[PDB]
């Protein structure tokens, strides 16, 4: 099973700053990675599909990139809305696996 | 007046390799493009220059159909202006492209449990291709054999699954218009 | 616009069956791909299985495939999820989702498993 490990467990960060996140897979998934955002006790929302393409109705400051076993999500400028939990997915192999989650924490 | 040979373009029992990519021309027939658009089998249906809904009421001079087998990760390279191993060395599309790219998954049909090595791609060439160029070569590259096999298998992921892709490159010369959409009774 | 809403019992006693139903509204269930997604409390997202809109092409998670049956009922424009012999560790929030699909003026493209449209989330509790 392709386990999905996100390295920052809790992202202590200040508003308006640069944000970076990481997703590392056990084996190659060939750029089939999606990124999600989950407000606490709310519905998750798709941000990135195919690891480099923004979903419909997503602000331009969200950007994802990478291939192989290294996938990153970068937020250029935070808001008072975007401290939440972020999830990383694969769908190259049939047991589709999500990430454990990474939290953006306000300094 | 008859319908086009699109049945055996899409449902052929053997597509050629990407380097020796097949090409056939439909000449006089009325073409039903909208049945292909509303099919439930195509994973991607991209169009450049012409809208696929308006395509059923546009007349052209002649229409080509370029059919070959490509990996799942590499369908993105079949687009005007991209680069890669196949976009440079195997099949090149022009920047002012006026056609459509149709593709679908074929893991149940083209893959083999022991590995299917009967599809080849050009790994080495001294230069990239001009648009709509084809070659067949055998000579050793200045170090290698340029042709390499894929190795499809149903166990492999979606990036390594075989995708059959058909490119319909429309033309418009000063010759009279033959390939029209079906006029509606 | 397309909307997904769940329907099912909030309390399921152990060693019995579980039934859920996602009522697709605002869009046709056919020619798409749909999935059931769980989330345990204080844990990350999980995947149950997927179904095709037309033809019933159906795949499960290998860790739960001996207990799950997923069915499509296109007459009512809805799809359902069934489980059997649920334990106390199966308490989770269940979402139904659509595998993504982006239609432009210049053609369309089917995503291989990203979930764009999601449900509200129905919290299932299991206790004796
Ligand atoms: C390729 O073959 C398939 C299967 O034979 C064709 O799909 C059928 O097309 C006819 C056309 O009238 C429909 O009535 C059937 O309902 C279709 N069946 C299925 C399962 O889709 C397909 O049309 C063929 N491709 C082309 C370009 O003709």
B142 plus B101 within the same structural domain: no
Given the structure tokens 């679908």, which residue do they identify? B104
Residue C82 burial (10 A CB sphere; 0-12, 13-18, 19+): middle
- Separation of CA A46 from chain center: 9
Same structural domain for residues B107 and B21?
yes
Distance from CA of A14 to the nearest CA of B (A): 38
The H-or-E segment that residue B33 falls in is helix B33-37
Whether residue B159 is found in the same domain as residue B143: no
Task: Report the relative pairing of strands C58-60 and A45-49 from DSSP bridges.
Answer: unpaired
Distinct helix (H) and strand (E) counts, chain B: 4, 7
**DSSP-derived secondary structure letter, C76:** T
Instruction: Provide the resolution (angstroms).
Output: 3.4
Mutate which of B4, B11, B63, B108 for ligand 1? The one with the most ligand atoms within 8 Å of its CB, which is B11
Residues enclosing ligand 1, CB less than 6 A? Answer: B 6-7, 10-11
Number of structural domains in chain B: 2
CB pairs under 8 A between A and B: 20
Residues from chain B that touch C55, judged by Cβ atoms under 8 A, are 40
Rounded to the nearest angstrom, the distance between the alpha carbon of B11 and the centre of ligand 1 is 9
Q: Measured between CB atoms, does C103 come within 8 Å of chain B?
A: no
Is residue B125 domain-shared with residue B167, that is, in the same domain?
A: no
Asked whether A23 and A71 are in contact (CB, 8 A), the reply is yes
Q: Do B90 and B28 lie in a common domain?
A: yes
Dihedral sign for Cα atoms in the order B87, B88, B92, B94: positive
Cβ atoms of C126 and C14 closer than 8 Å: yes
DSSP-assigned letters across all residues of B101-165: EEEEE-HHHH--TT-B---EEE---SSPPPTT------SPP----SEEE--B-TTS-GGGSEEEE
**A55 min Cα distance to partner chain B (Å):** 17
Residue located nearest, by CA, to atom 28 of ligand 1 = B7
- Interface with B, mutate which of A25, A27, A32 (most B CBs under 10 A): A32
- CATH top-level class for C3-126? mainly beta
The half-sphere exposure of C102 on its side-chain side, counting CA atoms within 13 A, is 17
Contact (CB<8Å) A99/C118: no
Phi/psi region, residue C15 (left: phi>0; alpha: psi -120 to 50; beta: rest), is left
Domain that holds residue B126: 115-153
How many residues does this entry show for chain A? Answer: 107
Main-chain dihedrals φ then ψ at residue C121, nearest 5 degrees: 100, 115
CB atoms within 10 A of CB B177: 12
Whether residue B181 sits in one domain with residue B127: no
Co-location of B61 and B107 in the same domain: yes
- Determination approach: cryo-EM
Q: How far is the CA of B182 from the centre of ligand 1 (A)?
A: 18
Nearest by CB to residue B45, choosing from C30, C31, C107, is C107
Tokens representing residue B159 in the block: 């990036």
Q: Are residues B77 and B141 in the same domain?
A: no
Q: Which residue of B has its CA nearest to A68?
A: B159
Nearest to C110 by CA among C47, C52, C32: C32
The verdict on a CB contact (< 8 Å) between A34 and C119 is no
DSSP, residue by residue, chain A: ---EE-S-SEEEE-TTS-EEEEEEESS---S-EEEEEE-TTS--EEEEETTTEEPTT--TTEEEEEETTEEEEEESS--SS--SEEEEEE-SSSS--B---EEEEE-
Question: Cβ contact (<8 Å) for C118 and A94?
Answer: no
Three-class SS state of C90:
helix
Domains within chain A, CATH numbers bracketed: 4-106 (2.60.40.10)
Q: At C87, list the tokens.
A: 């334990």
Nearest to C107 among B40, B47, B158 (CB): B47
Residue from B159, B44, C69, B47 nearest A90 by CA: B159
B110 and B55 assigned to the same domain: yes
Q: Report the alpha-carbon distance of residue B7 to residue C124 in Å, rounded.
A: 49
Interface test with C, best of A1, A39, A45, A49 (most C CBs within 10 A): A49
Token pair recorded at residue A45: 């929302």
Q: Does residue B133 sit in the same domain as residue B162?
A: no
- Does residue A32 belong to the interface with chain B, where contact is any CB pair within 8 Å? yes
Please indicate, yes or no, whether residues B125 and B49 belong to a single structural domain of this protein.
no
In the stretch 59-88 of chain B, residues with CB closer than 8 A to chain C read none
């Amino acid at each position: 099973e392709i386990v999905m490990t996100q390295s920052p467990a809790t992202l202590s960060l200040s508003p308006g700053e640069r944000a970076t996140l990481s997703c590392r897979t056990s084996q190659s998934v060939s750029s089939y990675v999606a990124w999600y955002q989950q407000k606490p006790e709310q519905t998750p929302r798709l941000l990135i599909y195919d690891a480099s393409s923004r979903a419909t109705g997503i602000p331009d400051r969200f950007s994802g990139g990478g291939s192989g076993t290294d996938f990153t999500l970068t937020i250029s400028s935070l808001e008072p809305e975007d401290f939440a939990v972020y999830y990383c997915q694969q769908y190259s192999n049939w047991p589709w696996t999500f990430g454990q989650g990474t939290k953006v924490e306000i300094k | 007046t008859n319908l086009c040979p699109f049945g055996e373009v899409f449902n052929a029992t053997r597509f050629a390799s990407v380097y020796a990519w097949n090409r056939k021309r439909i000449s006089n027939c009325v073409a039903d493009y909208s049945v292909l658009y509303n099919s439930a089998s195509f994973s991607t249906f991209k169009c450049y220059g012409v809208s696929p809904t308006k395509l059923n009421d546009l007349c052209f001079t002649n229409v080509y159909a370029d059919s070959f087998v490509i990996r799942g990760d590499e369908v993105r390279q079949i687009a005007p202006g991209q680069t890669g191993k196949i976009a440079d060395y195997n099949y090149k599309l022009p920047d002012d492209f006026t056609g459509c790219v149709i593709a679908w998954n074929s893991n149940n049909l083209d893959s083999k449990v022991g590995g299917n090595y009967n599809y080849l791609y050009r790994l080495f060439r001294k230069s990239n291709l001009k648009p709509f160029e084809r070659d067949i070569s055998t000579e050793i590259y200045q170090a290698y054999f340029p042709l390499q096999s894929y190795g499809f298998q149903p166990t492999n992921g979606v990036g390594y699954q075989p995708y059959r892709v058909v490119v319909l490159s429309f033309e418009l010369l000063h010759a009279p218009a033959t390939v029209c959409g079906p006029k509606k009774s | 616009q397309l909307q997904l809403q769940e329907s099912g019992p909030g309390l399921v006693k152990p060693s019995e069956t579980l039934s859920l139903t996602c009522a697709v509204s605002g869009g046709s269930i056919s020619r798409k791909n749909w999935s059931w997604i769980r989330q345990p409390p204080g844990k990350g997202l999980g995947w149950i299985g997927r179904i095709s809109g037309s033809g019933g092409s159906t795949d499960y998670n290998p860790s739960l495939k001996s207990r799950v049956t997923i069915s499509t009922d296109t007459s009512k424009n809805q799809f359902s999820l069934k489980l059997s012999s649920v334990t106390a560790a199966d308490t989770a929030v269940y979402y139904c989702a659509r595998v993504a699909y982006y239609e432009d003026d210049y053609g369309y493209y089917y995503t291989e498993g990203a979930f764009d449209f999601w449900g509200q989330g129905l919290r299932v509790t299991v206790s004796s």
